[PDB]
mmCIF file of C-alpha atoms (C1' of nucleotides) in Angstrom:
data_model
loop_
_atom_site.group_PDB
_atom_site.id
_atom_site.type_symbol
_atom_site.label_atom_id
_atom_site.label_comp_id
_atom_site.label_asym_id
_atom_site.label_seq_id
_atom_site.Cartn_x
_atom_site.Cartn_y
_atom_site.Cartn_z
ATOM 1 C CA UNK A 1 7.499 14.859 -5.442
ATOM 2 C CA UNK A 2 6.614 17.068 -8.360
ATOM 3 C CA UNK A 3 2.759 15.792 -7.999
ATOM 4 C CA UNK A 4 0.570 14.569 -5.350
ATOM 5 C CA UNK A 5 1.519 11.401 -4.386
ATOM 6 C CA UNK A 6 -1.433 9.115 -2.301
ATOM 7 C CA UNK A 7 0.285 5.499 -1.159
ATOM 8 C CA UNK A 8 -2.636 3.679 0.186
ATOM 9 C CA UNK A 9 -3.292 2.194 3.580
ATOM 10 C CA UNK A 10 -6.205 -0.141 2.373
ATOM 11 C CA UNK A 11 -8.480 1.802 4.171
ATOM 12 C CA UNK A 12 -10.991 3.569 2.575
ATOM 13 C CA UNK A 13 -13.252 6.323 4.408
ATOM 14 C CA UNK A 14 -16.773 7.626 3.278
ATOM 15 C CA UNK A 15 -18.162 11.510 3.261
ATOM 16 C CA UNK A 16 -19.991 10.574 6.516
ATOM 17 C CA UNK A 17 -17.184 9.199 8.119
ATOM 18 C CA UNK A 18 -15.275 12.659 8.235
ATOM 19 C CA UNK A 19 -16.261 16.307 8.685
ATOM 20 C CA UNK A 20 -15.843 18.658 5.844
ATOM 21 C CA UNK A 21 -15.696 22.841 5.753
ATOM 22 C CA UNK A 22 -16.706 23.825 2.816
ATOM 23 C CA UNK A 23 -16.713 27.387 3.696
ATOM 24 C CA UNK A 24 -13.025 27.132 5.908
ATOM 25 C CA UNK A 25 -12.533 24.728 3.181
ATOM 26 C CA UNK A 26 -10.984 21.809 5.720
ATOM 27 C CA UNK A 27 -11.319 18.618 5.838
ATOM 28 C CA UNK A 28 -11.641 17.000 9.406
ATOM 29 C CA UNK A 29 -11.109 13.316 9.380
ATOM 30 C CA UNK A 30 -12.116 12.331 13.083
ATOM 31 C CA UNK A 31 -12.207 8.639 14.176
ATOM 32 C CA UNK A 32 -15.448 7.064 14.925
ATOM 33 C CA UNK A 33 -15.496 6.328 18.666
ATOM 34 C CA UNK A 34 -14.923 9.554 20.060
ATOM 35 C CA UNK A 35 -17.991 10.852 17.483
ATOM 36 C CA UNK A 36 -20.460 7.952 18.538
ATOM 37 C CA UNK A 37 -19.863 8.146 22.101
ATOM 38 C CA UNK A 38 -19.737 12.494 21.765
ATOM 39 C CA UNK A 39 -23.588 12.121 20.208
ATOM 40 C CA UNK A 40 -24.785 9.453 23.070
ATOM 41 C CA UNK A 41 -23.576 11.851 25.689
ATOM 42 C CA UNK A 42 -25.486 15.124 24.352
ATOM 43 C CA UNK A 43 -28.314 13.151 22.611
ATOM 44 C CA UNK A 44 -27.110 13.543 19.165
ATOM 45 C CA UNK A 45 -26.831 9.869 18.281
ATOM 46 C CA UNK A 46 -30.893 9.303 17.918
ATOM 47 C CA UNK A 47 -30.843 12.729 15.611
ATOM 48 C CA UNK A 48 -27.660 11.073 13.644
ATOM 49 C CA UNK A 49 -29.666 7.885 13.059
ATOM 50 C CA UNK A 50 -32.604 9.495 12.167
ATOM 51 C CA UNK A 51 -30.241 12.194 9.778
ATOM 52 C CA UNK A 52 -29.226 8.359 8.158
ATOM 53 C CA UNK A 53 -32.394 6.908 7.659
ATOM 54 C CA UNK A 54 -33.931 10.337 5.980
ATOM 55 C CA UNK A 55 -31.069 11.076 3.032
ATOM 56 C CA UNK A 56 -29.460 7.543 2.524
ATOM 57 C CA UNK A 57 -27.615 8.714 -0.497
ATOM 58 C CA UNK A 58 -25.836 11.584 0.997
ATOM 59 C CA UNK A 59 -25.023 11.911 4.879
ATOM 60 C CA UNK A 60 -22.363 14.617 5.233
ATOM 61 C CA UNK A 61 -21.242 14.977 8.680
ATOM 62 C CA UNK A 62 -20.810 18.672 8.434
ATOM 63 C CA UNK A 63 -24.507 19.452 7.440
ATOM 64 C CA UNK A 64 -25.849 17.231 10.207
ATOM 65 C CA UNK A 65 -23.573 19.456 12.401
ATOM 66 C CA UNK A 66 -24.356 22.322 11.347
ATOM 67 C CA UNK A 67 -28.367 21.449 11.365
ATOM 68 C CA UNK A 68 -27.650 20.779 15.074
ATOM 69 C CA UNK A 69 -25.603 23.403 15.366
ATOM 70 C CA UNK A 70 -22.857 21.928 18.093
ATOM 71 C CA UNK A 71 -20.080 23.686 19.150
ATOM 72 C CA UNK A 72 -16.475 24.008 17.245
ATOM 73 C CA UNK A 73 -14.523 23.290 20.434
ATOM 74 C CA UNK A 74 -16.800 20.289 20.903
ATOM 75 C CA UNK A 75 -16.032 19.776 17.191
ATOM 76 C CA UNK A 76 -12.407 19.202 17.857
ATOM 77 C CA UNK A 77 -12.708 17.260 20.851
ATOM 78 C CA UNK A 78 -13.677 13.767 18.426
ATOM 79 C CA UNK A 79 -11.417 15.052 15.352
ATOM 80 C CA UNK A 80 -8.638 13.295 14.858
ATOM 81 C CA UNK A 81 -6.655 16.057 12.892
ATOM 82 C CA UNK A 82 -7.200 18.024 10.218
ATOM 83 C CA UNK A 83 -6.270 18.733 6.421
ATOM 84 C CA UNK A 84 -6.247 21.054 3.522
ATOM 85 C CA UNK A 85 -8.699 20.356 1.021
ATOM 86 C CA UNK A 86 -8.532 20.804 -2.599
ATOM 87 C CA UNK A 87 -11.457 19.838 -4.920
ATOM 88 C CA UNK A 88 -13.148 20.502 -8.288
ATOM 89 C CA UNK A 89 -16.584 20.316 -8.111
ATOM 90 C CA UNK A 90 -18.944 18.433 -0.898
ATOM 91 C CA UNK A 91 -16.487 15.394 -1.148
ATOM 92 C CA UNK A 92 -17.727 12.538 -1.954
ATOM 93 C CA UNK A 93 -15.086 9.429 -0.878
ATOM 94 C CA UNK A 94 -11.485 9.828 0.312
ATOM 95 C CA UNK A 95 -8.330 7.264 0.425
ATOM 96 C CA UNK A 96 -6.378 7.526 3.354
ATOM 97 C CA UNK A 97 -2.132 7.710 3.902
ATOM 98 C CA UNK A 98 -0.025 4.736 5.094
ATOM 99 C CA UNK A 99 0.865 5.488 8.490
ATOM 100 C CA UNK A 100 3.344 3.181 10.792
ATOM 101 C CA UNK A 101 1.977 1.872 14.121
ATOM 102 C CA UNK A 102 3.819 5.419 15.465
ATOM 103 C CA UNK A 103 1.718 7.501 13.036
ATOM 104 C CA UNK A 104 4.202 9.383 11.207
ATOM 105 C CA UNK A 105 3.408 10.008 7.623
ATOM 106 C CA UNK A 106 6.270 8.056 5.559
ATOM 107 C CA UNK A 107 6.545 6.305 2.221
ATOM 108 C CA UNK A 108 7.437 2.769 2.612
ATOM 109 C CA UNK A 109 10.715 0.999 0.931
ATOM 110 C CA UNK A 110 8.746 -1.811 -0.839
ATOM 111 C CA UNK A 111 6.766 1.129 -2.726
ATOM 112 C CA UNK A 112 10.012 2.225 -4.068
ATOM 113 C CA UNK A 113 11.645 -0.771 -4.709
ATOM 114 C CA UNK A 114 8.797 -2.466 -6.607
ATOM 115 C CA UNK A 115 8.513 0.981 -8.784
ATOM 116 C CA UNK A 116 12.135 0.671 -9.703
ATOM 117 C CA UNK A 117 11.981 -2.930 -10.247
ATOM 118 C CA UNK A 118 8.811 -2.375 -12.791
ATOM 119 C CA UNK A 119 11.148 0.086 -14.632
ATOM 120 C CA UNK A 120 13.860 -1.534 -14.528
ATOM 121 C CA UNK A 121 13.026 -4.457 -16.309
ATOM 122 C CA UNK A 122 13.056 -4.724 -19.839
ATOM 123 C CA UNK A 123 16.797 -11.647 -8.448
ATOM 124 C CA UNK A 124 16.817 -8.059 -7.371
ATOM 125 C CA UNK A 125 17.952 -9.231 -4.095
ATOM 126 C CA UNK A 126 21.017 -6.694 -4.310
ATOM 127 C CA UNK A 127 19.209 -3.242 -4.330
ATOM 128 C CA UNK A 128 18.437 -2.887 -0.535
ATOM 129 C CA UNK A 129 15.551 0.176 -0.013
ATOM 130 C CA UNK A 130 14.380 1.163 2.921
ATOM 131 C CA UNK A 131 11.753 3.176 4.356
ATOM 132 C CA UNK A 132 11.953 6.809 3.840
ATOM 133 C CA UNK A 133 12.283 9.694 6.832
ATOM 134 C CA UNK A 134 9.614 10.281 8.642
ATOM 135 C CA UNK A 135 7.532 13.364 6.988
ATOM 136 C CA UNK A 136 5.106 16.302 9.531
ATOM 137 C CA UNK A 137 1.712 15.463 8.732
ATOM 138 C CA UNK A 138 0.795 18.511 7.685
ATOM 139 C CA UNK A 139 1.915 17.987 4.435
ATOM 140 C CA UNK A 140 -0.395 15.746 3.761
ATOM 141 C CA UNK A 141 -3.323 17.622 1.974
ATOM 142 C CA UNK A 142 -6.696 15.946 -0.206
ATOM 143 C CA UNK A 143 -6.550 16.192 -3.291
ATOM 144 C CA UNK A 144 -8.597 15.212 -6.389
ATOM 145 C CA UNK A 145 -8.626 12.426 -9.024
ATOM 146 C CA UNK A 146 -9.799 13.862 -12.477
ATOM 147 C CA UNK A 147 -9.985 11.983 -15.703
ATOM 148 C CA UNK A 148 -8.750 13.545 -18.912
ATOM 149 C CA UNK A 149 -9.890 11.584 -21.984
ATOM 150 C CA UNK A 150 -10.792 15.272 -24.521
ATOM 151 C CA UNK A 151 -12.534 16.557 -21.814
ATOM 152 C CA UNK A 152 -11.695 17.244 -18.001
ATOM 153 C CA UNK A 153 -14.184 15.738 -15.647
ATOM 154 C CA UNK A 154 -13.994 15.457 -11.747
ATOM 155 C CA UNK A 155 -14.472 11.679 -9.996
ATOM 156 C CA UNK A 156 -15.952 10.986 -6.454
ATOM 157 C CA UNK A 157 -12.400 9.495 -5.537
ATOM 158 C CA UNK A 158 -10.591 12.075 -3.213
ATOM 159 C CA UNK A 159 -7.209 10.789 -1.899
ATOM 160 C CA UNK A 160 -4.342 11.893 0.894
ATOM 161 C CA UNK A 161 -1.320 13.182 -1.244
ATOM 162 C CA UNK A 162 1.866 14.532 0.237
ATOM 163 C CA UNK A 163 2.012 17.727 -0.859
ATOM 164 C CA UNK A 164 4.338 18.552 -3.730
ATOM 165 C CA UNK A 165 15.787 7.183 1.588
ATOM 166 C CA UNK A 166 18.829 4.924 2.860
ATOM 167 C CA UNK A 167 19.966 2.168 -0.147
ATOM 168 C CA UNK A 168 22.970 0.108 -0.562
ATOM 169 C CA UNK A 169 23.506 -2.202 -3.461
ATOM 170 C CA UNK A 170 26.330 -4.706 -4.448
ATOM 171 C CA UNK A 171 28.881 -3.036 -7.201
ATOM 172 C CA UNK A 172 28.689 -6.350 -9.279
ATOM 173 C CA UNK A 173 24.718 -6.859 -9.958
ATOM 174 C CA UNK A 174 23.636 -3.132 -9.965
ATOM 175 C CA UNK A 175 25.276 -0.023 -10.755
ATOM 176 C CA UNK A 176 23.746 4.107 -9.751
ATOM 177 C CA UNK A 177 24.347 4.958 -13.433
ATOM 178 C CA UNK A 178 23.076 1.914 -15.082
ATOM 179 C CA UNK A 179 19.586 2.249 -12.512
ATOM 180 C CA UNK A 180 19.440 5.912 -13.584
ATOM 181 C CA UNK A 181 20.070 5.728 -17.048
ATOM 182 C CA UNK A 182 17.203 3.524 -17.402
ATOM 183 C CA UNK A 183 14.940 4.890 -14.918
ATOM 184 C CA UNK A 184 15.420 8.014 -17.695
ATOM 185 C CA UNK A 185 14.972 5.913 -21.163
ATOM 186 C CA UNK A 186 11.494 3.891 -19.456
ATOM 187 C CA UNK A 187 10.294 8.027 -18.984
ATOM 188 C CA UNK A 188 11.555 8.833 -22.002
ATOM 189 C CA UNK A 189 9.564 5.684 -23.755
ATOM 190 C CA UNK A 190 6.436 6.442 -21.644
ATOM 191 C CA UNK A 191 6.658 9.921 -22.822
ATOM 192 C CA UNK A 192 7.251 9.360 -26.556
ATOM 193 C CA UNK A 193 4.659 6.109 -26.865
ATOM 194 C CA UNK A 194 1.800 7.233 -24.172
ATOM 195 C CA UNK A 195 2.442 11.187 -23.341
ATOM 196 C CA UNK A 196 1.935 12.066 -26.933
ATOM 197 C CA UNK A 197 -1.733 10.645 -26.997
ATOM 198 C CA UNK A 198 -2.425 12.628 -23.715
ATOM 199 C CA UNK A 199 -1.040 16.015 -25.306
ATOM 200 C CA UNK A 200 -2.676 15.514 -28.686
ATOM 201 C CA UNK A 201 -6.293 14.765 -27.037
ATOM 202 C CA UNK A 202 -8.190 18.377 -26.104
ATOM 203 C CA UNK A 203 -8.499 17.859 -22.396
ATOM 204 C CA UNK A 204 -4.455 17.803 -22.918
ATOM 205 C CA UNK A 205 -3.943 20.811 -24.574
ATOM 206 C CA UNK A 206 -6.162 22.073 -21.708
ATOM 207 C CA UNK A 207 -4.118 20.319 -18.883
ATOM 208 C CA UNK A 208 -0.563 22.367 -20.556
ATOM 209 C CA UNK A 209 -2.510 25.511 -21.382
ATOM 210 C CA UNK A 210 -2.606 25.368 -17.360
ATOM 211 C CA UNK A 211 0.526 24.794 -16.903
ATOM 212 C CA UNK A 212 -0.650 21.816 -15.175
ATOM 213 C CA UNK A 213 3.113 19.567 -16.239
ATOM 214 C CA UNK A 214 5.837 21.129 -14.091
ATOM 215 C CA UNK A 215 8.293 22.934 -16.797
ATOM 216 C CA UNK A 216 11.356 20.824 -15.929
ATOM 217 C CA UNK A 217 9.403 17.557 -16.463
ATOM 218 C CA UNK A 218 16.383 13.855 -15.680
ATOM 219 C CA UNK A 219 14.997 10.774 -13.164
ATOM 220 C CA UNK A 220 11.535 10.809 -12.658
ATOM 221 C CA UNK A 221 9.521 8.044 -11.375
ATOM 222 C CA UNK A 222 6.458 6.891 -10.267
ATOM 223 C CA UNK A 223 6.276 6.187 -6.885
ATOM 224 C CA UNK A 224 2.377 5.853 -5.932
ATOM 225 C CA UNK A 225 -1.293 5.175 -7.123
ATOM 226 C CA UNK A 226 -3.212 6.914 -9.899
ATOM 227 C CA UNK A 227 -0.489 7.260 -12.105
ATOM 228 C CA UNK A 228 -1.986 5.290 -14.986
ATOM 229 C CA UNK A 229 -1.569 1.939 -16.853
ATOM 230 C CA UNK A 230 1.000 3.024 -19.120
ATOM 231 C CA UNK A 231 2.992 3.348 -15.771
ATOM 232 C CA UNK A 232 2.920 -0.151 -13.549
ATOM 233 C CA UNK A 233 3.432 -2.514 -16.627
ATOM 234 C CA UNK A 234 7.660 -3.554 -26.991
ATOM 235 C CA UNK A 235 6.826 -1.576 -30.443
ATOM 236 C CA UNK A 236 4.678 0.988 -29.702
ATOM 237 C CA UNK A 237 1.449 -0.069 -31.789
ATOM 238 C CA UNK A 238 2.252 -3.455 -30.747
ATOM 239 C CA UNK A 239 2.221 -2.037 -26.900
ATOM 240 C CA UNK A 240 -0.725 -0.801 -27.350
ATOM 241 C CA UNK A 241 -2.846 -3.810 -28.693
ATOM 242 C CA UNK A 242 -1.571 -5.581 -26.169
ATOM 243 C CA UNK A 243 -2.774 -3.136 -24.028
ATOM 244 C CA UNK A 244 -5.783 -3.113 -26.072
ATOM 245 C CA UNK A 245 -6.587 -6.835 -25.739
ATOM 246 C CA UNK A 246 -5.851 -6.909 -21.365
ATOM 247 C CA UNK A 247 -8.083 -4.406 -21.304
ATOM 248 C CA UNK A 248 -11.215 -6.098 -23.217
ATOM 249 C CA UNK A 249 -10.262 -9.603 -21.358
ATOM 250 C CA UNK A 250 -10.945 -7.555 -18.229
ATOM 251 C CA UNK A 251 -12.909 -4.570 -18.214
ATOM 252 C CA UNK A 252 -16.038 -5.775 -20.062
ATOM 253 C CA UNK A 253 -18.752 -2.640 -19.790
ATOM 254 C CA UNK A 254 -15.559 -0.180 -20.459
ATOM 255 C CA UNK A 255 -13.299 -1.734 -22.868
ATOM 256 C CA UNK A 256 -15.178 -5.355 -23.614
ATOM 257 C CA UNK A 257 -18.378 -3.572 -25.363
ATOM 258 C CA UNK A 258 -16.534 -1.112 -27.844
ATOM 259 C CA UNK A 259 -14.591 -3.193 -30.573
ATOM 260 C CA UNK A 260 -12.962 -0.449 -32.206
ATOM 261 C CA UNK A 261 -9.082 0.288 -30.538
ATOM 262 C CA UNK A 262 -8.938 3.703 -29.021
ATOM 263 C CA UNK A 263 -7.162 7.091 -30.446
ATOM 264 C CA UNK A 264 -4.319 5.523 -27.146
ATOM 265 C CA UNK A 265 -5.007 3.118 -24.249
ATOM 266 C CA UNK A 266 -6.061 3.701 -21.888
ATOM 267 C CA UNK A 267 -7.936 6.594 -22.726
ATOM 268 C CA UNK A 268 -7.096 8.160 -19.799
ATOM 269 C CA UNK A 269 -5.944 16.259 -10.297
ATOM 270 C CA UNK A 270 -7.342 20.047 -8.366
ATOM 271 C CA UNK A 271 -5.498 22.028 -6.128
ATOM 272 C CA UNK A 272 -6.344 25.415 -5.245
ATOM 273 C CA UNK A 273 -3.442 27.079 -6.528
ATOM 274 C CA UNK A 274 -4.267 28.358 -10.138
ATOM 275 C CA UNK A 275 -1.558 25.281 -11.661
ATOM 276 C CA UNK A 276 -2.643 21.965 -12.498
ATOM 277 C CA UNK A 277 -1.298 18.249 -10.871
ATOM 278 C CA UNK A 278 -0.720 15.049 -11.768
ATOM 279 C CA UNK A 279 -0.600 12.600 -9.121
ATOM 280 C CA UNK A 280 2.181 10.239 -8.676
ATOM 281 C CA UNK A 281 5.083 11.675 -10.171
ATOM 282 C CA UNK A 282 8.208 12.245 -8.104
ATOM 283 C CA UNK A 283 11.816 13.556 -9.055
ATOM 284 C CA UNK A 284 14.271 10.949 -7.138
ATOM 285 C CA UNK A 285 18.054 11.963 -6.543
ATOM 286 C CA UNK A 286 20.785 9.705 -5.577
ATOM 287 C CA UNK A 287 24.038 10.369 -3.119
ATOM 288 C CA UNK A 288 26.593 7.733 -2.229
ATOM 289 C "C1'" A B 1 18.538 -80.841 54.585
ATOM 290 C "C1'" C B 2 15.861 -78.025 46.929
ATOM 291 C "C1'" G B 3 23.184 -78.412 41.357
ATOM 292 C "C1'" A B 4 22.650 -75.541 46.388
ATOM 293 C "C1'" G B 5 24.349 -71.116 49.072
ATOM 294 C "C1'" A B 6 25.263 -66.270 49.082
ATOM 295 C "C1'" A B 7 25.549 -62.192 44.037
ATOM 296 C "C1'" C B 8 21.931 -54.717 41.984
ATOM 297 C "C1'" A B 9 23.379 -56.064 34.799
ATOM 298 C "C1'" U B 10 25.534 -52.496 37.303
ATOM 299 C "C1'" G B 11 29.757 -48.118 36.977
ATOM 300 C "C1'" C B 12 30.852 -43.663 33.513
ATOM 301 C "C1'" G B 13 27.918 -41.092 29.819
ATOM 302 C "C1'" C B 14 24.253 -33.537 27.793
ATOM 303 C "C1'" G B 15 19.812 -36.339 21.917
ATOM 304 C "C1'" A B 16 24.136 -33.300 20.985
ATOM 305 C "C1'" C B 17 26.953 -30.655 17.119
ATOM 306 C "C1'" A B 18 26.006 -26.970 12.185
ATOM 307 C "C1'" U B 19 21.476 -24.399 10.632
ATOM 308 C "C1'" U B 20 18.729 -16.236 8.511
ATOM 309 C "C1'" C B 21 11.019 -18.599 7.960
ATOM 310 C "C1'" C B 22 13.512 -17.012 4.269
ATOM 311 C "C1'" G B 23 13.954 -15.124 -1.410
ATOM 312 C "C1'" A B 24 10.494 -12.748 -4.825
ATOM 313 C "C1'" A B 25 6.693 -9.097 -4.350
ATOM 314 C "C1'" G B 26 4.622 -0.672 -5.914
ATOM 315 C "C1'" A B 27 -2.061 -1.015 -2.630
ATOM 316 C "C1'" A B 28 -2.726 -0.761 -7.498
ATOM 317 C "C1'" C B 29 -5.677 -0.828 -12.465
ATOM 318 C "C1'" G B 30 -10.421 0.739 -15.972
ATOM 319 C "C1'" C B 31 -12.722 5.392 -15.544
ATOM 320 C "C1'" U B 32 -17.410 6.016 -15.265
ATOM 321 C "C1'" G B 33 -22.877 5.445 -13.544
ATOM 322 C "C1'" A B 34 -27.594 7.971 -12.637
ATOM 323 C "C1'" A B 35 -30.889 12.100 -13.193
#
RNA sequence: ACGAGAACAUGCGCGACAUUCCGAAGAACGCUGAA
């Protein structure tokens, strides 16, 4: 996990649904129960309604708690847990982590397997995946989705990354060296027919004047969300007219209005250590 | 002082045997909008 990697629970939580510290720079995410029934016991539910219905647009929880200035201990009594924060602008959205019905942070097995199916091809009942071991949640930290297309720019979207697996197969259908020989040439051909774009553009040269790509970056793969649409999909200017064309069918405002095919398409992460991240990208290894 | 009188359509018996709700699925894509 050489970058932040956010797998998705399909639950989405606002900036007033969690706390945020600017200052102690944590994020609390606390569940909602324990908060509304917290502010109908001291009175602070009226004052939270009223704290809505002023500033509709933004409704942090942290300034409301600060402007009635409740206690910390009472703070932690409703918060769920906590998390390390990284961002590049307080946060606006945030995408939460897949958690079991235990509440263990782990990657599921259908993740993987539908990555390595993607790649692959270019049935499947042999390759058996299953889940992953059970990870300590505290390595789950918020991170930061930023857009690079020649020039750097933050987005509202904040998501739960991991901070930077049992399998059998049948000898006949799939083979460890055949998998990971082209798990390595589909890098290699995003690299040489997408990466280029990204390192020529001058948000790029930015991004590896960071450091931001680790220096090793062998099998790497891309195991969650944000990674792009060169990932979860040829000659390469036919590849990208293709790509071209989806793009207008679909997107109308982004792609649909401007005729003229991009410099690459698509066009197009923070942490508070001084190197740059890119979110999705893991470095597998196999053991029989 | 009835082609009549008596006379159980009854005895034994498993709706059973064989059967993977399963195979295929990355919670992910565009990145921007307003002032």
């Amino acid at each position: 996990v050489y970058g932040p990697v956010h797998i998705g629970s399909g639950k989405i939580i606002r900036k007033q649904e969690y706390i945020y510290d600017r200052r102690k720079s944590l994020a609390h995410i606390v569940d909602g129960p324990n908060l509304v029934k917290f502010l109908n016991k001291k009175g602070k539910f009226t004052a939270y309604l009223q704290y809505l219905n002023t500033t509709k647009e933004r409704a942090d929880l942290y300034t409301f708690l600060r402007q009635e200035q409740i206690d910390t201990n009472d703070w932690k009594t409703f918060v769920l847990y906590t998390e390390r924060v990284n961002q590049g602008k307080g946060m606006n959205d945030l995408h939460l982590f897949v958690r079991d019905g235990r509440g263990d942070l782990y990657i599921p097995g259908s993740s993987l397997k539908g990555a390595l199916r993607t790649v692959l091809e270019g049935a499947f009942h042999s390759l058996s995946i299953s889940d992953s071991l059970p990870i300590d949640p505290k390595n789950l930290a918020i991170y930061q989705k930023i857009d690079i297309n020649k020039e750097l720019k933050p987005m509202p979207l904040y998501r739960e990354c991991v901070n930077v697996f049992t399998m059998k197969i049948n000898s006949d259908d799939w083979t460890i060296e055949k998998i990971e020989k082209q798990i390595q040439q589909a890098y290699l051909q995003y690299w040489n027919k997408w990466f280029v774009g990204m390192v020529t553009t001058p948000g790029g040269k930015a991004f590896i004047k960071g450091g931001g790509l680790p220096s090793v970056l062998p099998t790497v793969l891309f195991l969650g969300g944000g990674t792009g649409f060169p990932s979860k999909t040829k000659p390469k200017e036919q590849a990208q007219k293709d790509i071209f064309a989806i793009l207008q069918r679909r997107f109308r405002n982004v792609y649909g209005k401007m005729a003229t095919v991009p410099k690459n398409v698509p066009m197009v992460v923070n942490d508070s250590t001084n190197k740059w991240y890119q979110q999705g990208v893991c470095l597998l290894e196999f053991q029989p």
